[PDB]
């Protein structure tokens, strides 16, 4: 049995093994969102300043390409746990890969060590991020109503890592010792691994040690042919372009652009088709299409506060926090800590707003429209500030006020799109619907990987006013069809 092997208690009233993976996902997401927050500055900083010296636009662009691939790679890694390794194996493999990628940035490998890092982390992330989340659900038996808060606590380490690590890592940016910071994250990740190795056998029991739908003899051949070849075609066209000096990041940034727009369509096409989706569950899939837009428009802006907003604040504002007499230097890595901090504070409190309303709750597109409008309004804010002040160095107060408006928008849109991801998924294409909602984050990130090239031609300020406006315009449009979508 799956639930007879594992302790049903031991961690704030939940199964002991939720204590094991909290400590694992904490030390992973800590070193991820830490690395993720130096990395931008390790790229477009000058060589004398220990950086690498990459074009400001290639560096902003890597950031969104790197991001999107973290989330696309959850799709084959959900698969490899499903057909070859099982959830446990994939997570262990994923973790060991990640630590390799962090160690790479610690070594002085300049442009090679950067991408080998991206390679090793992206790989392990898809084997770990989605399959660690699988194992936590499988710890609760079929009719166990604890599973709900058990995921709230799990994702609480997610925000705890992502809160604490920009804080700590801020010093290695000031003393411009990038290598040393990537080593801290690197260790921090190993802590998680050691802890899993030491205590995974006894708290997780036998869960996910075997794959669910393993591959038959002929499937091992078919798939190992197909997958084998694409790996070859890819390798070659990289090899070919490196040694003919054709290769830049426009190859990668355009590929992913393509995937990020291709992959949502396939999923809705293979979904809306098939006679396995009744007339009830269909049309509802046509009703998530609009929501998928509003989730794409939203995460566009949100995930840009990791490569666009924070550069703008470092270069265009006084970087001096200034609240009711409390002034201090606002460290630039500290921008990536607002977004989790307000989640950790106000995830429980936007939970009461919807519970005290019961049925007069906002609809579902209503949330999705609220949270896209705000993110939209948030880019209109910072654009207008820059437009008012012009050349004069304004307060970093304003740059923070954008981040906040955005994270308040997410409070309506993050808890709803994943409540609704695998809520009304077709009672056959459930995972296929998990993969949809997640792509709201991956497509935004592949669109951003190319969207940022409009900064030079439109100017840093006007950029901000164009994006905020497509968000609000296109949101209001969909809001007129907001009763038809609600019929579901
Ligand atoms: C900048 C970051 C701190 C960012 N706001 C953040 O908290 O990212 C969380 C990492 O993404 C995974 N994740 C977090 N919450 C959820 C969630 O609620 N559902 C799913 N499927 N994935 C989630």
Residue numbers in the entry: 9 to 496
Cite, word for word, the article reporting this structure.
Recently we discovered a prokaryotic homolog of PepT1 from the bacterium Staphylococcus hominis, PepTSh, which was able to transport a natural thioalcohol-conjugated peptide, exhibiting structural characteristics similar to prodrug molecules. PepT1 and PepT2 belong to the much larger POT or PTR family of proton-coupled oligopeptide transporters, with homologs found in all domains of life except the archaea. POT family transporters belong to the major facilitator superfamily (MFS) of secondary active transporters, and use the proton electrochemical gradient to drive the concentrative uptake of di- and tripeptides into the cell. To address this question and understand how peptide-based prodrugs and nonproteinogenic drug molecules are recognized and transported via the SLC15 family, we determined the crystal structure of a bacterial POT family member in complex with both valacyclovir and 5-aminolevulinic acid at 3.1-Å and 2.5-Å resolution, respectively.
Following extensive screening, a crystal structure of PepTSh in complex with valacyclovir was subsequently determined using the in meso crystallization method and refined to a final resolution of 3.1 Å. PepTSh adopts an almost identical inward open conformation to that obtained in our previous study, with a root mean square deviation (rmsd) of 0.499 Å for 480 Cα atoms. The valacyclovir drug molecule was clearly observed sitting in the central peptide binding site, coordinating a single water molecule. The valine end of valacyclovir orientates toward the extracellular gate (TMs 1, 2 and 7, 8), which is closed, and the nucleoside part of the drug orientates toward the intracellular gate (TMs 4, 5 and 10, 11), which is open. Valacyclovir makes a number of specific interactions to side chains that are strictly conserved between PepTSh and both PepT1 and PepT2. The amino terminus interacts with a conserved glutamate, E418 (E595, human PepT1 numbering) on TM10 and through a hydrogen bond to an asparagine on TM8, N347 (N329). The carbonyl group makes a hydrogen bond to a conserved asparagine, N167 (N171) on TM5, and the ester bond, which links the l-valine to the acyclovir, interacts with tyrosine Y41 (Y40) on TM1. The acyclovir ether group interacts with another conserved tyrosine, Y79 (Y64) on TM2 and the nucleoside portion of the drug makes a distinctive pi-pi stacking interaction with tyrosine Y163 (Y167), also on TM5. The only nonconserved interaction is made between the nucleoside hydroxyl and N426 on TM10, which in PepT1 is a leucine (L630). Removal of Y163 abrogated valacyclovir recognition, underscoring its importance.
